[PDB]
Each structure stands twice: as structure tokens, then as C-alpha cells.
Amino acid sequence: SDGDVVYTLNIRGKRKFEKVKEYKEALDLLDYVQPDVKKACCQRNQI
Amino acid sequence: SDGDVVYTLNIRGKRKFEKVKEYKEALDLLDYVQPDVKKACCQRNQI
Amino acid sequence: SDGDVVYTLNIRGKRKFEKVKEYKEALDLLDYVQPDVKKACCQRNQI
Amino acid sequence: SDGDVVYTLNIRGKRKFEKVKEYKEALDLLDYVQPDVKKACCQRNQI
């Protein structure tokens, strides 16, 4: 249910942000695509 | 391109691992689903 | 030198943010405490 | 009490790993240095 609560994360440091933002993008995509793509992803490039 | 180079990450601590593990899944997914779903994701649940 | 550049990351979704926010805190901490604590941390709970 | 349980995370992909490993490093540090350093970090480079 908690997927639209805009939680701002002011990350001081560009390089630092690049890491975190990569995680937020990844989390947003995790919460985006079908659960089955995750299974197929598991056997695509995951371990 | 480095997406199939098995890099083991021994994460001591269950709760800790749970955080990283989802990140690795999220990253695996970032490199999995079509770039267009990421665009649509941007307008689905991203900011 | 990019460690003090405020890069806002609006993370929609509480649970999502909780993960990334802990990552930004963790990164901010990586970029804070003494380098020797990292060595000791490496052998404290890191692998 | 879950900070010393070795949970291996085989991250396929170097670039991917660099991100997650940075998270695990950061998480390990979060559970390492004193909670007061986090407070001071908060007002050192955190937002």
C-alpha cells in the first residue's frame, strides 16, 4: 500500500546520490514490472 | 558491459542482507526489464 | 569533490523510501566515520 | 539481533555489485560506528 507517499531524500554528494538514486530507481522498477519477470530475471542475470 | 560477472557479497547480518538483497534484485531487474517500462514506471510510481 | 552536493531523491512509497533512506544514511556514514573504523568494520561485521 | 549472520549475495554483474556492495559496506558501517556519529554525521554531510 505504501507506494505513493512522496518521501524526499536529500542526498548530499553527487556520487553518493548516484548510488542511492540507483537504488530508488531499482526499487521503483521492482515495484513496477510483473512478479514473473522477477522469476525470469532470477534465471536471466540473477543469483 | 558487466552484468553476468558473479560477484559474491557475503553480508553478515540477516536484516542487513534483506536490505542489500532487495537492492541486488532491484539492480538485477533494472538490467532486466525493457527501458520503456522504466519510462512508464517513471509515471507509474516514480519521482 | 562531490560529497556535499544536495541531490534530492523523491521516493514515492514509504517502504521503498525506508530502504533507500537507510542506504543514503549508510552512504553518508561511509563518507563520515574514520577510515580505520572501516577496516575494523571490515572485520567486525563485514565480509 | 541479526548482524553477524553470513548471508551470501551472489551479484552477477560487476557494475551491479559495485552498487550493492557499496550498500552492504554502508550497512555494515551503519551497524558499526556509534549512534552518536550518525547524529554528528547528520549535521556533517547528511540531509
UniProtKB/TrEMBL annotation, chains A, B, C, D:
Sequence ranges assigned to domain p53 tetramerisation in this UniProt record: 3-33
Subcellular location: Nucleus
Top-level taxon in the UniProt lineage: Eukaryota
UniProt record similarity statement: Belongs to the p53 family.
Name of the protein in its database record: Transcription factor protein
Gene behind the chain: Ci-p53/p73-b
Portion held of the full protein: 374 to 419 of 419
